[model samples]
Target chain A: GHMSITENTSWNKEFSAEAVNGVFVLCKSSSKSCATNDLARASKEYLPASTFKIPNAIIGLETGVIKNEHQVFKWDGKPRAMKQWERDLTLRGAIQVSAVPVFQQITREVGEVRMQKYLKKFSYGNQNISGGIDKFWLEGQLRISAVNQVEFLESLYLNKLSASKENQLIVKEALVTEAAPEYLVHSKTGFSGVGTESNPGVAWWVGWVEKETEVYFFAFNMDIDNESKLPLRKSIPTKIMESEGIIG
Target chain B: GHMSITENTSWNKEFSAEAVNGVFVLCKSSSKSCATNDLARASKEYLPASTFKIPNAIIGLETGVIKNEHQVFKWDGKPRAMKQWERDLTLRGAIQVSAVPVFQQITREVGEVRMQKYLKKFSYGNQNISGGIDKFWLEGQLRISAVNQVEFLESLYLNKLSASKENQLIVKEALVTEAAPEYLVHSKTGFSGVGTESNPGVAWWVGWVEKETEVYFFAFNMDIDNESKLPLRKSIPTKIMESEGIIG
Candidate 1:
């Protein structure tokens, strides 16, 4: 089916007021339609950064690199980016805290051939695994736009991806950031490090909401100025969803 | 706590297309706002008909007139209005099929005093029980507008109806008309029968959708020319909700 795209500037003020250059795309599965704040940025690709964890976890499960969500990845007993990432953790814990080192290990075991095959099958962002096997999604040539992110997420939500239903559900459950009797949210956040003066980094908050019987897929990314703006990745989307009555 | 309402004529075409005189009101709990097709009809009071089952069931549970959802009510072995109503039913089964005779019996046992007391606490409609204990909501003086219906349903959805949370939940679960892994709909349908030529009857469909963490309350009523138009009670609100992307 064809998707009707509307550039809804109602969200533009939200971005400009925060002094961030970004785009937000919200897609409704039922309507097969999307509303975006900026057409260009929403279509322009950027590094998936930590957001790759979504597919990485699913690929790990599908390839038997990891047995299930309960599979444990013992920490190397070495210091890491954040203190919380240093401990022994399950797949659930690793994704919750966005443990980069643990995912890197999982991706390495997935191997380039299977990784490339699955990404191509999943139709994930350019499907380019250049740079380094494990580092490509972080700082390599692989990139995906906000609109593509939502498309991929929508497929995953409907179990339309090339992965097993059980594996897709396992990864989806791992992405749950908010759960209540009335609604459920499966979201992931990503941040490419604040780059050097020449090129800046990008931050991301991408996920979907299952309310009643409707699924709303959303992706938001903005250029990073400093680490202080990292929280905006989640806050901006939350405000946008609130304004649209997608969430309370 | 004020509500901002917009007279959205976008749905007028739907009503006109069907050649039905009606109104539809959709309320978003988070925004405390609503959109209706006809502002005048949305606020005009009418006999609640079978839609009263929602509150009747709640009152039955709260006052001990009825036990839990599992309590069975054996049929009298006499012919009833519908064949489906000829057999035994539990609270859940009765509400699902809209067993009117069963609810009338329950309300009679609820007694006028307790029924009046609870209606006051619920702030339902005009809070008038003058028509008779078991008959008021059906054909007597008790009247409520579409807007009031949404307000009352909203309170029940929030478990703020001045009833025990447990009892409220029991009735709520019984009201489930549609259920899926992604969403749940709690709704009821009502009919007052084909009336005299001078006075046409009213039909009703009212309920709330729990999607993710947000709730949407809707009430739709149309003046009935004949029994054939009853299905529109559900379909009209559905179309409007679909147009708003509130459901699939």
Candidate 2:
């Protein structure tokens, strides 16, 4: 009864056609408006996928496994077919490239025991890791709806999570995306793919923006196509931000 | 010559056996480990799926379509099939929810012309936006290999792209993932699904980590199952990163 639609969500027509099945979300604090094209999909909880890296980094930092931003985790030099992963890298470099191995290392360091602790503290979606340490967020036990994503970002912005705000700052600093005239953008994407390449499982794009005045948060997730080529992750939210006028 | 396998990348036994097709990558800077589970599958690229959100966010921020983080984007409030998306939201909220309509609006705001403009600038994947703004990355002209994903991330980290650090910060901030004692995690995920729900397609999980001294990057794309339930996305890399003793 309290929810309302502020803008036309026509873009989803074409997006959904190609993406197979999916959802998008946009919200604003200034005008008190929040909207979506697919109300049902947004509420549905799926896998957080790589998006879990955000919280993983925080716990890693909090626990002291990740030494520093420059700390170079050497490549095992075992013929990684991707080619790029063959060399050494800093944490920043790893994050930018989406290096699973680097994160794997960090996650292992973080371990399931502590990971469960933090996730529980955050009351993170489903908050189940019985699926295995590395496998948890990918699917199995960990699951979250788009609503959860937005809520998490909002909580982080408010410095409300059980994790320390100071540590959050460090994590936030690494999340820097784009710098606008009046604000800074921070975000992350998550894809939980299972089954075949043609029928992928889920995709996610979530995060917040830092305006001169305050911080804003958001999340988007959906079921992608066989190739999962949908760019709606950023497109949908970008539109919502624009309608609300969040850019520089 | 660069890809050095420290040990056998053989997680496929559990992963591939359960799933139809997939790829995994793991490497370190210090060690000579650059190994993958399936050499043949790893090289092949079906579609980046939802992974495109990584660059999409960056470009969206750079283009200024996303106006503000706190800005709200209202929903249609219609009787939709899904239950969660029928509400108002902010850019932050939408992205987390993966509402197609919200992203659709943003892409429309970004426009096909501008989107193509930026895609061309980044030489993103196939760099073909002709597939239509909403449809391009999903299947049309946009296509990228895991190698390309890695390259794109590396360039973004070095600030080699046309976008400014301001926009970059915005996108990165949204991507804020995990925390390390000294480093921070930033990343995104993508899933591609198509055909009948039983028949799926490609999927992706990509991003990087920033350490105190430098940055490291990586990407993982695999042939997913129609059911979409494998956790190899993180596990494969976990095995690789674990060999390096990257964490506790």
Candidate 3:
């Protein structure tokens, strides 16, 4: 018997409410594709904010430089002259609050050599349609398609992040613990300045949810107008998950 | 001045290639789209073979459980009763050569808790994919698609595997040094039995390569007809790289 598309209509309803330009969701293992936009720009390039932290975690673990996830780096809490979000922090706490300083410190520690090495390994932004920039800042170069984002998430789920399992776990635990409600969800969110354009640079939510038989890695990006005035929300990530029958 | 599909010979070439399932050289990333026949009927899933060593590399690095990638785990140069390949090896060498015992030993060190923790991070296989009878095995219930394989590679590139750059570097270096060419190509290969079929099983070649500005990932699967014969001459991996413009 043919499977009825309407059987999964609930997904459609939730998707409609997100008001996103487009949406793409894939079940890990199954490789199924469900999307709202026939030509959704969901895969189009956008600036990654805190969402890039997940990779930062990988760098920390692989280096052996950081002893433990809890090994606290002092946070002076002194505001930076240039950046609004500056503060003293440890790796774990930096990620928890989405602090930029923590990541900057990490990037300095990993340095360009090590950073570029793994960045290539992760294939960051390798799939951008524009193909202009070869690499991006701490986040990565170019943009990731929704499909590619989910694929990366699956790799994370497998503990195959090209490093050791202990390091993978530390990052996974840090992300998962702070995100809440969804016990299995390990994720990061990002928002950046878009250009002179009024739209927020780009807002993102990407992560994975573990199920008994399968896991789902998902990413959502929205080009927000006047993003500074409007705060980033978890609604889209939640909607994407709920639509996919990932969370209640 | 406008580009038209009708005028593009390459488009026509691509169309023709797709029609007959021919493997053609192209600029875009290679993806696997399987027909019903490609799906295995027998319940047995393919072992990850050397590809499993990737996670093994990460597990060893992150926990501080293992010292350095250089830390040697010598092989006895004798094959185990169940397997054919064996040799003296270090964790680094094992992954470089795709040795199974080295990976098996790494898994033993990681134990179940650490194994599950990192495995969950990479989102290996499907969440629904069952765990193996033993912790070291791939939690038997899971399977991965070629698309998923690429995504995992991306995560590794992003340094999402373990939060450690050093650990991530060890594995990435081993992969690039052993398999990929000079520029930046980090990858791993796998071969495994697929049921009672006397055939040797399935073979996999998946990894990432970076040129001037582009990073490309490719994964392919081939079915071996004779287990005893070890069909074909050159290594499946090197062949794929040469065909894909990696080697002259």
Candidate 4:
């Protein structure tokens, strides 16, 4: 008698056997570049959107320009005319929800010249987006590739980019939210658009997931051609986290 | 007898002191955040622009994608109309001048897909740049911070980026182009426009300089408003070296 392993029956049984313990599949490939590229591009490079704030917090701490992580800068309870999440929030809390105003103020305080220096130093994407002008918004902006997301995560892990121990801790603390997993998943999410624009907006989810033995840094970009219609709810991050066996 | 210690004269002597041997200054302000919105805006964060070929070579060797450093690839001596420097150049010589066509061919032969995967894994910059849709020239583009430049150089010093001992030796051998008084400077220069339409381009100078007991990484960016009209004959690498008193 010959026993052959079939896809649904054999695999389902194997998966069920490890279901209680949480099965981890290890698939080896000589080249996963195609897959990597697909994932990266699907995530959008043109619009950093709100996800850009994660690096903003990092810049704040590293420069010692922003001294207090817990130092609360209070926002009015009034909902922002443009954004709903813009009500009263702390810098830390604001970052979690991807609030626009807080970061806008932060960037304002950081100023263009200083910001330009760091951006140049860090070599942000689209280094030359405009002719002799640094463009900061979603339009013709620098984008993060999936690989670059992984690399930045590595840099964070190595403590190469953090300003001070306290600052690193603050940024790390801000990264954790109710949406995060039980195991440490430090991340930031972003979504942005105005009413009328082609490719009206972009959404970003970038962060690191740390397990006992290893850490995984990931970034996902979602471009919405029609933002008013699509909105941020349907973006990949929300769906991925909700799906079973997508991320643990 | 009246003896007066003249402050200006003493300070002048001190300021212009030949006894100083060399005056070297590196400005890394801890009070400043290294990552800023402006940095993302101003720099030319294109793919390693040949600097990446260093690691590509390493990956090729480690994966047995290539047999050896001596593995020869033919070059057509035909003059290309668009390219500035083009003549039959080897892998070793290609590295020196950063021959795009030669490295691209080698990387492609290593398998374009494989090259993409390794680059993504390395996470040199923003991950959004990795998506397959972006085209290598546009999407796989990378930006380096002065700090990141230093980090890469340190990796070279630590022999961390290479795959094999032989490959590592080949990179190191190619890097040491000139000897300075106190140490050897291993460097590369990069020039590219900020955007497809943007005329005011940027010039990059990145490398490491070693003195008796100290090794320092140096990087500088010059915004060349007029690439053709710039009066300087030497590249930023040479200019920075001269400014640092590494050369006269």
The DockQ ranking, best first, is 2, 1, 3, 4
Q: Per lDDT, what order, best first?
A: 1, 2, 3, 4
lDDT of 3 at A56: 66
Candidate 2 segments whose C-alpha is farther than 4 A from its true place: A1-248, B1-14, B27-35, B38-40, B79-84, B87-89, B139-141, B194-200, B211-214, B228-231
Error of 3 at A182 (Å): 9.2
Compute DockQ for each candidate against the true complex.
0.02, 0.04, 0.01, 0.01
Best by TM-score: 1
Q: Which candidate has the top score in lDDT?
A: 1
Ranking by TM-score: 1, 2, 3, 4
Judging by TM-score, tell me the better candidate of 1 and 3: 1
Query: For candidate 1, what is the TM-score?
Result: 0.52
TM-scores vs. true structure, each candidate:
0.52, 0.48, 0.43, 0.38
Tens-place lDDT digits, model 3, residues A1-248: 11111123344454456454434454554235434332346446555557767776787668765666545555576765344245334454467667666566666777666766776777655623131222244244545655556656666656666877657655664565322211235667666655445444566777766443245666676665555532334675576566557777
Scored by CA lDDT, what does every candidate get?
A: 0.81, 0.64, 0.53, 0.48
Q: In CAPRI terms, where does candidate 2 land?
A: incorrect
Which window of ten consecutive residues has the lowest lDDT sum in model 4 chain A?
Answer: A21-30
Q: Please tell me which model should have the higher TM-score, number 2 or number 3.
A: 2
TM-score pick, better of 1 and 4: 1
Clashes of 1: 7
Residues B136-201, model 2: lDDT tens digits: 666665677665566666666555678865455445555555654345555666666643446566
lDDT by residue (A119-144, candidate 4, tens digit) is 66554554433322223644544665
- Winner on DockQ between 2 and 3 is 2
Q: Model 1: per-residue lDDT, tens digit, A61-110?
A: 99999985446778778789898787777665677788899999889999
Per-residue error (Å), model 3, residue B98? 39
